[model samples]
Target chain A: ALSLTADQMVSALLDAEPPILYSMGLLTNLADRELVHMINWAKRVPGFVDLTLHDQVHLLESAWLEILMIGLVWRSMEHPGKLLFAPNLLLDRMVEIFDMLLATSSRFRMMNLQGEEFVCLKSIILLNSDHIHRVLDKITDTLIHLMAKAGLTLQQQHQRLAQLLLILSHIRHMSNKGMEHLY
Target chain B: LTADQMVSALLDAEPPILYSSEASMMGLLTNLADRELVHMINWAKRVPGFVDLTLHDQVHLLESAWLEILMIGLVWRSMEHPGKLLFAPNLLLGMVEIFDMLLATSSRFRMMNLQGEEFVCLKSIILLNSGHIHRVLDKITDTLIHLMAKAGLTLQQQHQRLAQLLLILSHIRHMSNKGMEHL
Candidate 1:
């Protein structure tokens, strides 16, 4: 028991939890706690308050899972062979969904995501779908600056930002399915 | 003329300044307005949860808020032009008073820096609250709050932002009353 590896300990703890009937409860508590963090972060997201209160709730309700999912992907990117998901959350369909997230992690790695890109992507995910352009455009200027500082040519800067946004579709696909599977 | 006829006319009516070259301009604005009505109708159906409203509710919301909706669109189109209120290539003056309200309102919107999602969300709230005149909604307000959260605001920032937006609504509401009065 004491010899258990970190993941093994995690797996053992996961196994100790009763399956679905109550296993979901543990996650629910986990989610409830995470929600406070989510809510606070959203509140500070810039122009979020300009929306009506009703719009506010729907935005949160609509994007919370996607936001959380993105966070998971970003957080776990540097960890080797480590995924913090349910080994339950998405239910019976967990494996395929996990594959998508795993693939995304690889793609993120392939792209050599800097810390700022993760943040920018987080805003893109939290903001509504229609807003993907605005947030992206907002960051592209900075992106160009970063690339220039790193010596990317103008074309390279543009291409890099485009690549970043395109990966968003990957995140978006995962988010949609994640919600669909849950529902 | 009936109210609908009156509104359609006002949207296209030319001011004294445009009198000589204005006839064709009137026709153009008239054509543009009719087209906008069609576009607005098409657009309204696509509003989040809008289609779910009963058919009669839909009709009342449209009939009640149509002008307000149009004015919001006008405000948006004009914001980009700075001293101009251009809805199409050419676009106004009671209507002068109304234009003043719209111009000032658009300026307020500009200063507040309402993002696109918040703008659309505000429009949807306006559409939903149009009639009932028993009225409907709390969802959109909550939705706006969630959006504020995402747009990046601290709790205090949210309150200030919401205060400005809510105050602007009174202006929109005031403009609407004047709009109906003029209608």
Candidate 2:
């Protein structure tokens, strides 16, 4: 069998969906399945298991929506401004409310942050808790070190780190909105 | 002092007496912080139930929260400029400079779209630290909660507003720890 190209693999996953959601019941089934997949994939990421079980659960509970949105934006990088969900569920309406997500993703692309940096970024967001100070300190130190390898001057590096932190703040806002929708 | 006047006094519009010396800068920040805490403690006494608390408890709440309140004022002042910090009338600092990371943090908070009312409530909430502090701080928290409830936000919006405020305060906590290392 001929192997699928990267584009083909993405299309297979994203551009295919059932003809209809049919009912609220079915729609919820789909939602639950997608959430399970998201959590499983998140768990598989490096360092996710290293956190305390309590910290992991709290972070995931607080951050799942943000992680989902971050993944959506990362994958939609090629489409610019458009959010392409896994089941071909186009989210055109999200553009106005979550506009910063797309904008920040493009900026991330422009910075050409590495895969390792993205890993670190996700971890930083995941381990964010009121009392996870030690974990945050370690992860941010790692991220700063990774960013330093980008060859920017000291001032430029500080600026970029500051920009990244600011981006997380936007993600925090988005999560708040997402929670509002839920509760 | 009124809340507004207390905030302004902590912000201190005049340039510090010694600008070129780190030791002097740290001293000035510490002195102003102490003064602000004293003023804020007095203000808290004006709350209906706060004065009934033991004096030690009142002092504890003030001491625990003054740094967070200082960061709140710093953020508000930083909103006047985009890339530079208005530390005082003449004590301008570049946001990227190493010595002014707190200023950079404040500028980033300004970018997070905090409204004046939200800032006011946030300052009060931070002053109380949390509802569990003591009878006095709990009363203060309740008053702030009532004020926020009267602000015409839906339950969802109120939840989100509080979350964003605390998230910003968490960043201030990070900055505070870093500043202490340098001090």
Candidate 3:
């Protein structure tokens, strides 16, 4: 089949004596598509294309996984027990690395992460730093408008903003863990 | 053939889109990254106090900061090129904003008329994070200060030149954010 659910893939893996070639083949194919989509999207992101060719490649090289992980978390959040690697691919892959990814997905789901915040987070991820320098104010201001829809008090908004920004660190740690695991 | 067999045959006969160009683009990036990596490693090893660190730590430092060093060098080299931040023959970045930032900073570095010593001073410092790296950095930094002192500039003049040269780090750190994506 061209597409299957995580649960379905899991069943297939269990049924097979060793599920290696098929899985790698499928994942690799999907991954290339995802990477192409990523760079094209990156090309569209404001200010991304303006960096020097070297800096541009350097930024993509560094942030590739961070952005990919964030994207996986976002896409997988919609379905329970499913990690969507692509629209046509999904794999929960037991509770090893995926447990942490799913946990992060759950966090995003609970926080009700807005599209605005998600895009803003990606921008900050693309231009990352400690508090992301001057851009932090601009990013946090986005969260304010998001919370403002709730008619939140100033203190409440600030509290929520702090909570949101805190997750950036956690997500980075998650990416770090994956890098270590891969290495 | 049956309906499914006919469909499968047709699908197998077709090639995917988003292929040749992006594939070629990525091929170019990997070539550039690996090619420059050789230069970065060779250059870093010859720094005054670099080889004293454990080999493991040295690799890790390079692993963590290659882009920073490369970008710093790229900006410094681009000073004379006006707009282009050339990485290799026949390569020019098509992106902006972040690139505009690079071009702007390169222009300023040119404006300052940094002595060769100051330029090397800036490049050497970008590989550092802290601790052992910091110790090496202290000596390298002091080396520049002493060089300026011996050049017969007044203390105030040396301080101003050193301070201005060091300020390049802020811009570097900014681009480094985009490189590291740690927001």
Candidate 4:
């Protein structure tokens, strides 16, 4: 990406941000459709379809924000230290918040997460609710394998996977706070 | 109380008799969760106007926020026994695959060194996370703001504490979601 002036960056950020819809209240207009789209896309992941319908719904409702935040962080990974939000919209007040998230994302990147590992992490977040059985196990198994292939020993793999989960946990919180701020 | 004292009381506080059976483990976790939940509700009741909210709304807040609270309690217990999850003596999960998951997640919160007063305030903030229904929580938010003032924290300090607590809660939330996956 070419270097942009601050003015250009802000405009780019605005362009990349999802369109905000207002109805009875802030952002409620697009809420349903946005959520449905997220769930539909998530269902395409391996093992997602196998989960019971109720588990799928539960996971979607609980995990969507974290998943979105993870995506944001992953996108920002190409530029270390700086958080590149959907576009270039930056908030002086929220620099600390962005910094916190960027730091966590940098750690994940430094850990050298492969594509499969990232997918496994997303699946793990989706299944974090303790509702599914075989699907959860298989996904976890895949993550373990991915970590092992990344050169971690068995114990290290477990530790590394756990660390990733920890990062996702913080991402969940950031998402929640972000939602509150948005509204 | 200081964070150290709170940690000691929560961890060293005698837990129920240990049981190894899956059914029994579920029962133990549920029992502890129930008790902790009751304590939280009681704490909420003391919040100046919390009890004035409709019963339906009160239940809504508690139900939605319970997992976050339970995860906090679990993290506290886990910290007391770094290698073993302290559900009960016999009910311990040795540092196995799943155990490592919990350890990795819990360590982030442990690193925060949450002060007791901050923990109490954090609980209130979680309770006020009724973004699912907007107007229902307006007054509740003010009550919490008052509580924050009462805690004697400077604005910056409170913001710092809030960020730490929310990040930890998010991790715990992820753990609960993952627990569902493994179920």
Predicted model with the maximum DockQ: 4
Error of 3 at A70 (Å): 28
Error in Å for residue B129 of model 4: 22
- Model 3 reaches an interface RMSD of 14.2
What CAPRI class is candidate 4?
Answer: incorrect
Candidate 3, residues B1-183, lDDT tens digits: the string is: 332332233234322111117568668766777677776777767665578888887888788677667677667667778878765546655335557878887887887766655666566656654115544555555555666777787644554445445534645655655555522
Candidate achieving higher DockQ, 1 or 4: 4
* Candidate 4 or 2, higher lDDT: 4
Candidate numbers, best DockQ first, in rank order: 4, 2, 1, 3
- Supply candidate 1's per-residue lDDT for B65: 76
lDDT of 1 at B55: 89
Report lDDT per candidate. Answer: 0.57, 0.53, 0.59, 0.54
- Best of the two (3, 4) by TM-score: 4
DockQ of each: 0.02, 0.04, 0.02, 0.10
What tens digits encode model 1's per-residue C-alpha lDDT throughout A1-183?
Answer: 223332343333233222222125676686666777677666655456556778778878757876766766665577534555443333322576677777677667777877655655665456543233233234333344555667765434444554455455456556655665676
Q: What is the interface RMSD of candidate 1, in Å?
A: 17.2
Q: Each model's TM-score?
A: 0.42, 0.44, 0.42, 0.43
How many collisions per candidate?
A: 40, 0, 9, 13
Instruction: RMSD for all candidates, in order, please.
Output: 18.4, 19.4, 21.1, 16.8
Clashing residue pairs in candidate 3, if any?
Answer: A49-B95, A49-B96, A50-B95, A50-B96, A50-B97, A50-B99, A51-B98, A51-B99, A128-B183
Query: How would the docking of model 2 be graded?
Result: incorrect
- Report the C-alpha displacement of residue A93, candidate 4, in angstroms: 9.0
Provide i-RMS per model in Å: 17.2, 15.1, 14.2, 14.6
